[PDB]
Amino acid sequence: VQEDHVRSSFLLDNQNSQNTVTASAGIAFLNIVNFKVETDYISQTSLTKD
Amino acid sequence: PVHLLSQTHEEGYSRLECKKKCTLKIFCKTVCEDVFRVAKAEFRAYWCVA
C-alpha cells in the first residue's frame, strides 16, 4: 500500500509604478528679453515578490 | 527567583521595510529599502531555588 502527495504553491507579485512630472516657463519678451525655467522629475518603483 | 546572571549582546539584522511614501499627497510611491540596525538585548537569568 503506497501513496504520495505533492502540493506546489507559486504566488508571484509585482507593482511596477512610475511617475513623470515636468514644469516649464518662458516669460520672455518684455523687461527681460529672455529667461527660461523648466524642471523635470521622474520616479520609478518596481517591486516583485514570489 | 533569585537573579542568576545579567548579560548583554549586540547583533545586527537588516530588518524588513516595505513602506509607501506620498510625493505631494496626489501620488504615492512604495520605497522598499531594508535598513541596518544593531539590536541589543540584556539577558537577565534568574536562578530559581526553593
UniProtKB/Swiss-Prot annotation, chain B:
It is found in: Cytoplasmic vesicle, Phagosome membrane. It is a multi-pass membrane protein. This is Macrophage-expressed gene 1 protein, processed form. Disulfide bonds join 18-32, 22-28. The gene is Mpeg1. Pore-forming protein that plays a central role in antigen cross-presentation in dendritic cells by mediating delivery of antigens for cross-presentation. Dendritic cells bridge innate and adaptive immunity by capturing exogenous antigens on MHC class-I molecules and presenting them to naive CD8(+) T-cells. Acts by forming a pore in antigen-containing compartments, promoting the release of antigens into the cytosol, enabling generation of MHCI:peptide complexes and T-cell priming.
